[PDB]
């Protein structure tokens, strides 16, 4: 295709170029915080973020080479994972707080307000701390995010199965290239690579837990149309 040709620095550049903006919330700090309102805020934010994520995925190398049916499948499976790792990335330099938006920064205390959120909150918080001690780089972050997009729905005739793996391999090569440039030894590169990928198992976990009540919250309560369709894809 074309994505197989890129060098490590080329894909880093391309991925960094494709980065979606950090959106704002309609949060009015001149008001208290109810469970329904806050969830409505995060829902509105996620919906507007989804539009940027869809057009970001197109700029991810190899993604446009896949069929329309498969592109849909990958996004349906990984959208909340991608929203979550982006959230965790934004919150790296904010200990004990999650930065949903520059105007929306909540700690674990204000996380209780939603029933059954404080647990996710702590998981996202621990993930952000994990990135903090690792001193996760932006170049590494965008690689991890691309991995989640291509890996999460790949296990769920079709040449295509293998092309995605070939891209994933190239993304692995890129992370290693970055770590070697950082001066890390080979043993350090292998360990750090493992450490980053093991976190994706937790991001998967948080997504499942988060998705699980989004479609219980769907009963009662305030979801947009695109959000409902992608939530439909899970149950």
């Amino acid at each position: 295709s074309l994505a197989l040709s890129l060098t490590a620095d080329q894909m880093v550049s391309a991925l960094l170029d494709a980065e979606p903006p950090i959106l704002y919330s309609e949060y009015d700090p001149t008001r208290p915080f109810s469970e329904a309102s806050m969830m409505g805020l995060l829902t509105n934010l996620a919906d507007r973020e989804l539009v940027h994520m869809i057009n970001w995925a197109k700029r991810v190398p190899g993604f446009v080479d896949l069929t329309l049916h498969d592109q849909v499948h990958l996004l349906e499976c990984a959208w909340l994972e991608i929203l979550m790792i982006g959230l965790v990335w934004r919150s790296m330099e904010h200990p004990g707080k999650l930065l949903f938006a520059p105007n929306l920064l909540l700690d674990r205390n204000q996380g209780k307000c939603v029933e059954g959120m404080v647990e996710i909150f702590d998981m996202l918080l621990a993930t952000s701390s994990r990135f903090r001690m690792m001193n996760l780089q932006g170049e590494e972050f965008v690689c991890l995010k691309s991995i989640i997009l291509l890996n999460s729905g790949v296990y769920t005739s079709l040449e295509e199965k293998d092309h995605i793996h070939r891209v994933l391999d190239k993304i692995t090569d890129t992370l290693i290239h970055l770590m070697a440039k950082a001066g890390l030894t080979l043993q350090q590169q292998h360990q750090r690579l493992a450490q980053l990928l093991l976190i994706l198992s937790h991001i998967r976990h948080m997504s499942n837990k988060g998705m699980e009540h989004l479609y219980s919250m769907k009963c009662k309560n305030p979801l947009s149309d695109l959000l409902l369709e992608m939530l439909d894809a899970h149950r």
Binding site: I54, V72, L75
Partner: peptide, 9 residues
């Protein structure tokens, strides 16, 4: 399906 459309248009 909105997602399918946006991935096109």
């Amino acid at each position: 399906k909105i997602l399918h459309r946006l991935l096109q248009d």
